[PDB]
Amino acid sequence: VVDGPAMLTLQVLAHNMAERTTALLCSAAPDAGANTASTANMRIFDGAL
Amino acid sequence: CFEADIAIPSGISRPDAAALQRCEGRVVFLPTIRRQLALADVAHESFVSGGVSPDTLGLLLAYRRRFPAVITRVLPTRIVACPVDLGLTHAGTVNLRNTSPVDLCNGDPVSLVPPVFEGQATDVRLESLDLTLRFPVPLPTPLAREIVARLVARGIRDLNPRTPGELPDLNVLYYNGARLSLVADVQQLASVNTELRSLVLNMVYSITEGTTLILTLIPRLLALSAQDGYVNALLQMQSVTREAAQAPMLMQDGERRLPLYEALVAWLAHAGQLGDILALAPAVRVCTFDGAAVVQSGDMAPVIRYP
């Protein structure tokens, strides 16, 4: 149940919007605290839209 | 032994004759080589210079230019002492008394340190012959080299105040356990100053031209830090090495002089000799015949020659 002047105020769509989604991939290393010689080659990838 | 005697000069307090009996195996600093000598230059009143008594760094400098001697046999007429500097030619291994809180090891070099302990003053008093006696404390030599660096640096903090009064005391020692507290009462300046200068002047010559190339590998040190055990334990937490991390400077003349090999020579010449130029020379080594691996506090350990 949504009346006229609610969706009439959908006029404000012109101000902000979003174009499309984008997969973000920025990986990481072990921390200061587990970063040793064998773990220096270690990477962990994380994906998100 | 090349026998040297010290007679009992004048009178006896009758229990104090027994006090000379339980000093068998101790050390007398007599500033000579004599066939007979009075007991006046023996005691700490002779250790006292003109007007003033030495500090525990000055007593190091006072034990510098005198000669240690081993109590061998105690007569009521004389005391036969064997001149450590020469007459250590003993296959009989003339015996010493350990007067020290540390149970030592077998095989330690033993160097002599003035009494600086909180509870082992070694103060025995003679009142018929008005003299005061401080016996030196025989100790193992790495533990001996852990002490002399503390007491000079404690007197380095006697030059500059600046910091708040809560200083690290330099007064907690570590041998396998065994928390040791020593005495911090007086720090004479000239005993600190002349000891400080040779710490400066030797560290001058211990740097050379090819030494400078090693300084480039200071960030190379911490690269081994997070990838092994040995290095990370070698790298101290209270070190400037972890603090200084936060280059050939070409000047290359001739390049056939072995510049890196020549660096480790003169560094070892003066920075390699820092324990013995500040403190006394070790000439006493732990050597028990029965296979006993340690020597108790108060025991009579057999003594062999220079390490």
Swiss-Prot record, chain A:
Coiled coil: none annotated. It comes from the Viruses. It is found in: Virion; Host nucleus. Self-assembles to form an icosahedral capsid with a T=16 symmetry, about 200 nm in diameter, and consisting of 150 hexons and 12 pentons (total of 162 capsomers). Hexons form the edges and faces of the capsid and are each composed of six MCP molecules. In contrast, one penton is found at each of the 12 vertices. Eleven of the pentons are MCP pentamers, while the last vertex is occupied by the portal complex. Homomultimer. Makes the hexons and eleven out of twelve pentons. Interacts with triplex proteins 1/TRX1 and 2/TRX2; adjacent capsomers are linked together in groups of three by triplexes, heterotrimeric complexes composed of one molecule of TRX1 and two molecules of TRX2. Interacts with scaffold protein; this interaction allows efficient MCP transport to the host nucleus. Interacts with capsid vertex component 2/CVC2. Interacts with the small capsomere-interacting protein/SCP. Belongs to the herpesviridae major capsid protein family. This is Major capsid protein. The gene is MCP. The chain holds residues 885 to 933 of 1374 of the full protein.
